Design a binder for these strands. Structure first.
Lengths: 177, 178
DNA sequence: ACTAGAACGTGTTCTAAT
DNA sequence: ATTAGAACACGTTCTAGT
């Protein structure tokens, strides 16, 4: 949990982190900069987040939970996949920071990276049924795998956004056949 | 291409990368150590490979090429065979897998041509396993590659066991073939 | 516990000298 | 084009003070 002061500090830290990530991407999210923008000390920043990976991944978790607050299965899956497709193109640098930290994480951040993962799959399952079944969760997991792979292909400028939408529609079509 | 001594320098660099990564993993393959083991200066190492990511992904491409130089009844059984080879080699040298895989996913646009070079190969290996593969077999192969990378990351992060990865990959295979 | 600043490790670049 | 090494940039840790 934590006190109100600690909650304020944390919020300021993650807000600064997502700001600098937005303007400059992963390499711009520097710990001295994130600490300076949140008006914290660096040792405070590392007290609240043990590594840069933990920081960006926790920001990704907060953002995806916030997005979690607010027809045919291919239609609802196309709606979610298009929402996250346009959301990927919305801020490419922020997506670069959060995604790259998500995949570069080591075992020390496993728990964090797991939560995010388990939540995202959950959304993909909640976007297929208005409670889901077992097979819906499985297809959701495979879909999320293809979305991560194609997201990495786009962020590294080896696949266009049209290519991402095409290959993920190919994945959903391959699963719903 | 380069001179003959330049080719030998590149090979020695990549062999040093493979050895250090095998013995210690991603944090162990350090540029000074790689340069010293390869008997080159760090500036030379950076002339041959512009970044640590380019270095490790290049070793990855070399390895998967040598594997390309070298399987069942159903394409279900052939796909399961290649998946099993990938799992067994994965646990065979987990620190080398951690090094090259984390360099692969952490990679930059600077190394796009490298990351694209490996991916298209691994896809070409999953497709040619099911096969002259169809375009449908190629799309299935690509989805399989994606779930294999996801579960590979989960296993290297100690958030999935080997049996979890095997179960999820076979599950994906059944969801894709039938 | 928060702040300020020093300091250490490692990826990456720069210098001097061939 | 290569080498030995210094120097720089950023993640990370540690010390002293409030």
């Amino acid at each position: 949990l934590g006190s109100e002061a600690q909650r304020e500090r944390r919020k300021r830290i993650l807000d600064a982190t997502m700001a600098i990530a937005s303007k400059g991407g992963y390499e711009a999210v520097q710990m001295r900069a994130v600490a300076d923008r949140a008006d914290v000390a660096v040792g405070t920043l590392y007290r609240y987040f043990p590594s840069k990976v933990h920081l960006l991944v926790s920001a990704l978790g907060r953002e995806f939970s916030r997005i979690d607050a607010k027809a045919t299965p291919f239609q609802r899956l196309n709606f979610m996949v298009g929402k996250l497709n346009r959301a990927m193109q919305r801020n490419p640098l922020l997506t670069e920071a959060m995604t790259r930290a998500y995949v570069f994480a080591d075992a020390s951040a496993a728990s964090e990276v797991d939560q995010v993962e388990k939540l995202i799959d959950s959304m993909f399952a909640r976007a297929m049924a208005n409670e889901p079944t077992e097979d819906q969760y499985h297809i959701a997991r495979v879909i999320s795998d293809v979305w991560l792979s194609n997201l990495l292909a786009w962020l590294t400028r080896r696949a266009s956004a049209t290519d991402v939408s095409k290959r993920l529609d190919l994945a959903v079509r391959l699963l719903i056949g």
